[PDB]
Amino acid sequence: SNPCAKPHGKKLATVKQIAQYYKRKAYIQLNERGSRSALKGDASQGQYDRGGKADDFKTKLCEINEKHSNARSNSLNPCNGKDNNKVRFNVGTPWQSGEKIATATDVYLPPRRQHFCTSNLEYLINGGHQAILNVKNGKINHSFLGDVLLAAKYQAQHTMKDYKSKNDKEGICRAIRYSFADIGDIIKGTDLWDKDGGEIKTQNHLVTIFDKIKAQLPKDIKGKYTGTKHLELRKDWWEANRDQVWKAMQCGNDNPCSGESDHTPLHDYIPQRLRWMTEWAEWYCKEQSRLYDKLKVCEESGECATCKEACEEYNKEIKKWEQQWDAISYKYLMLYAKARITAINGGPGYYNTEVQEEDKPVVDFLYNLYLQNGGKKGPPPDTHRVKATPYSTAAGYIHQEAHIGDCQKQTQFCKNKNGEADPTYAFRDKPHDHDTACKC
Amino acid sequence: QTSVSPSKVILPRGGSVLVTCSTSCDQPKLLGIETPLPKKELLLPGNNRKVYELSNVQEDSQPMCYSNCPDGQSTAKTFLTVYWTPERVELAPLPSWQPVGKNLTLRCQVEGGAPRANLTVVLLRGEKELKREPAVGEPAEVTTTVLVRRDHHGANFSCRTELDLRPQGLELFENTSAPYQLQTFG
Ligand SMILES: O=P(O)(O)O[C@H]1[C@@H](OP(=O)(O)O)[C@@H](OP(=O)(O)O)[C@@H](OP(=O)(O)O)[C@@H](OP(=O)(O)O)[C@H]1OP(=O)(O)O
Ligand SMILES: *[C@@H]1O[C@H](CO)[C@@H](O[C@@H]2O[C@H](CO)[C@@H](O)[C@H](O)[C@H]2NC(C)=O)[C@H](O)[C@H]1NC(C)=O
Numbered sequence: 202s203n204p205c206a207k208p209h210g211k212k213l214a215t216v217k218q219i220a221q222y223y224k225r226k227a228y229i230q231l232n233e234r235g236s237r238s239a240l241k242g243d244a245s246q247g248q249y250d251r252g253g254k255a256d257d258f259k260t261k262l263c264e265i266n267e268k269h270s271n272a273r274s275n276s277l278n279p280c281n282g283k284d285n286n287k288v289r290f291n292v293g294t295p296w297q298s299g300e301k302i303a304t305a306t307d308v309y310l311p312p313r314r315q316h317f318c319t320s321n322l323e324y325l326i327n328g329g330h331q332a333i334l335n336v337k338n339g340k341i342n343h344s345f346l347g348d349v350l351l352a353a354k355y356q357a358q359h360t361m362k363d364y365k366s367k368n369d370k371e372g373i374c375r376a377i378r379y380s381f382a383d384i385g386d387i388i389k390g391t392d393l394w395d396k397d398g399g400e401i402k403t404q405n406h407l408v409t410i411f412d413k414i415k416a417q418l419p420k421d422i423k424g425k426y427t428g429t430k431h432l433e434l435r436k437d438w439w440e441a442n443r444d445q446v447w448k449a450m451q452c453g454n455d456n457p458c459s460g461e462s463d464h465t466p467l468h469d470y471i472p473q474r475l476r477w478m479t480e481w482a483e484w485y486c487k488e489q490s491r492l493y494d495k496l497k498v499c500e501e502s503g504e505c506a507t508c509k510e511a512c513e514e515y516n517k518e519i520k521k522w523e524q525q526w527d528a529i530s531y532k533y534l535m536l537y538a539k540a541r542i543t544a545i546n547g548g549p550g551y552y553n554t555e556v557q558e559e560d561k562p563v564v565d566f567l568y569n570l571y572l573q574n575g576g577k578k579g580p581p582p583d584t585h586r587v588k589a590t591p592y593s594t595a596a597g598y599i600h601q602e603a604h605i606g607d608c609q610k611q612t613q614f615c616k617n618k619n620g621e622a623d624p625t626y627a628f629r630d631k632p633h634d635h636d637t638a639c640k641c
Numbered sequence: 642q643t644s645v646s647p648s649k650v651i652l653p654r655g656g657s658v659l660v661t662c663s664t665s666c667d668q669p670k671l672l673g674i675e676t677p678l679p680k681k682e683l684l685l686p687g688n689n690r691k692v693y694e695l696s697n698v699q700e701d702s703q704p705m706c707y708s709n710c711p712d713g714q715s716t717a718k719t720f721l722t723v724y725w726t727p728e729r730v731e732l733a734p735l736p737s738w739q740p741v742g743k744n745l746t747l748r749c750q751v752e753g754g755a756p757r758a759n760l761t762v763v764l765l766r767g768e769k770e771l772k773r774e775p776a777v778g779e780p781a782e783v784t785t786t787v788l789v790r791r792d793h794h795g796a797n798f799s800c801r802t803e804l805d806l807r808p809q810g811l812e813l814f815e816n817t818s819a820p821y822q823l824q825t826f827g
């Protein structure tokens with residue numbers, strides 16, 4: 202059972218079950234707008250200024266390279282200049298945050314996301330070069346999918362090449378699923394890392410490219426899309442092309458990754474903030490394990506000096522992560538409260554919650570997560586009066602969805618079992634089995 | 642000195658709202674909220690910021706965020722605007738059988754419904770509007786005169802209310818009365 206949830210007998214609804222609810226809503230929308238045939242691209246029907254043969258996308262998709270692109274030649278390949286020092290999958294890599302990273306508050310950037318193979322997408326429009334915009338009529342969509350498939354293939358292959366322990370087949374797939382979803386948010390325009398200049402340019406190009414895609418849509422289809430940034434169009438483009446993008450990410454893998462729904466992941470239906478929060482807990486547990494392993498020298502005052510420095514190194518480093526976890530917890534707490542209040546008020550149409558534009562799908566996801574876990578919907582009885590949960594906290598969410606297997610002894614993400622902290626607390630000053638050991 | 646988010650709220654009655662009282666000071670002596678509404682304070686690390694969940698909002702309230710600061714005591718207000726559909730939408734009892742040529746008065750009484758500036762009352766013969774006026778007074782009375790004709794035999798007359806909350810991004814809340822089926826003779 203959940204060690205961070207108050208005693209409950211409610212019928213549990215997992216995040217994946219909500220992601221499937223959003224998967225169903227995504228294809229219902231695309232089919233009702235009848236834009237699938239017009240939005241689904243065929244990269245073999247595109248034009249590629251870098252030299253690559255278009256047909257390769259049909260005949261030998263896993264053989265495509267930097268030549269099968271419309272990116273400026275200075276962008277040598279999608280992974281060019283990304284993670285030179287190779288820190289991405291290093292156990293203790295710090296997660297950057299603040300106003301310099303995201304508009305949305307209390308966002309922690311995954312190093313895997315920081316060093317992402319999207320260089321081709323960044324250099325599609327750069328200093329005069331705009332090959333993607335100069336392609337023959339009716340090929341912009343097809344040529345765009347080519348660069349998206351190339352960025353996806355290179356991102357997955359970069360992961361297979363530099364992942365910590367190649368034998369961890371599940372770990373590689375976990376990162377490939379996160380990368381797939383992150384590609385989706387970049388394409389959809391919902392990516393949180395919006396303060397980075399290169400990422401700003403990538404998004405500016407995506408709008409310019411979608412200005413042309415929309416212009417080449419049929420009269421009846423074109424009218425169903427409104428918005429300067431083409432957010433609804435980009436949402437439907439992703440739904441129409443995400444299956445191809447996923448298959449491109451299996452290229453060169455001796456151990457291909459499974460898709461839990463229709464042979465594709467559900468992750469790209471979970472909002473980015475929640476996904477990144479899950480990844481944070483998983484990569485903290487790796488660091489907690491590394492720091493716990495340094496206390497092996499403390500097998501026993503005296504000659505326990507090597508233990509005293511190991512106990513304090515554990516303390517100073519764990520508290521560095523706890524500060525990030527607190528900001529993550531207190532933001533999630535606010536967002537869940539907003540979602541629960543929306544449900545108490547009767548959901549959308551009955552109540553418009555005050556929240557950052559970036560957190561609207563997060564409040565919406567947690568709203569359905571609340572309702573499906575036993576939460577009471579509908580407006581209060583006084584609205585239409587006639588005359589005569591385990592996911593309530595970020596700690597509870599983590600124990601339900603995140604891989605915490607790497608955390609040694611200190612595993613509980615909440616200070617208290619349901620509501621001085623517990624000895625099994627993840628962010629404790631020292632491990633509970635090393636209490637007498639650290640006090641030599 | 643004292644700030645409040647949101648500054649203006651539109652919510653259904655009996656509903657809840659999340660209010661954040663904040664101050665310009667770092668370490669204030671006093672920080673709270675004056676309201677007779679049931680409140681649950683959400684525990685946060687901030688000592689100059691306090692989050693409150695206000696429940697059972699039955700009527701228009703002005704919860705006052707207060708803060709005693711070294712520079713001086715300051716107050717901030719949020720404007721809660723409550724909404725609810727009419728409690729009673731009904732046409733005045735009228736006998737079904739009416740003779741051809743009669744000057745028939747249809748009276749509809751509308752009990753409640755707020756905000757009144759967004760509530761309008763409609764009198765219809767089937768789906769055709771006869772009289773549409775904004776709901777004024779308690780109870781709001783809408784009247785129309787129909788000259789009874791042979792053609793209206795079997796026709797259904799109804800009273801409808803429209804609480805249009807779409808300008809502030811909500812739904813248009815519709816309500817219909819019990820229909821009156823006219824039966825003609827002569
Ligand atoms: O075509 P409209 O410009 O809408 O004219 C209407 C129409 O009747 P006519 O088609 O005979 O002109 C109405 O009747 P309906 O089409 O809605 O059935 C109405 O009658 P109501 O009393 O049913 O609202 C009324 O006709 P009347 O004088 O018979 O009441 C009036 O036509 P007038 O210009 O002749 O007044
Ligand atoms: C009730 O009706 C009034 C009038 O239509 C609405 O007021 C408008 O609201 C929009 C958005 O807030 C403003 O941009 C307009 O300037 C307002 N017009 C006037 C004349 O005041 C009001 O929002 C409606 N109430 C609700 C709850 O939707």
Ligand SMILES: *[C@@H]1O[C@H](CO)[C@@H](O)[C@H](O)[C@H]1NC(C)=O
Pocket residue numbers: 585586587588726727728729730815816817
């Ligand atoms: C008004 O409409 C709502 C929603 O359809 C309904 O719940 C309520 O009972 C209705 N009230 C009256 C007075 O008809």
Ligand SMILES: *[C@@H]1O[C@H](CO)[C@@H](O)[C@H](O)[C@H]1NC(C)=O
Pocket residue numbers: 795796797820822
């Ligand atoms: C009036 O309503 C009744 C049902 O209450 C229906 O049988 C009848 O057809 C309606 N009259 C007209 C003119 O549609």
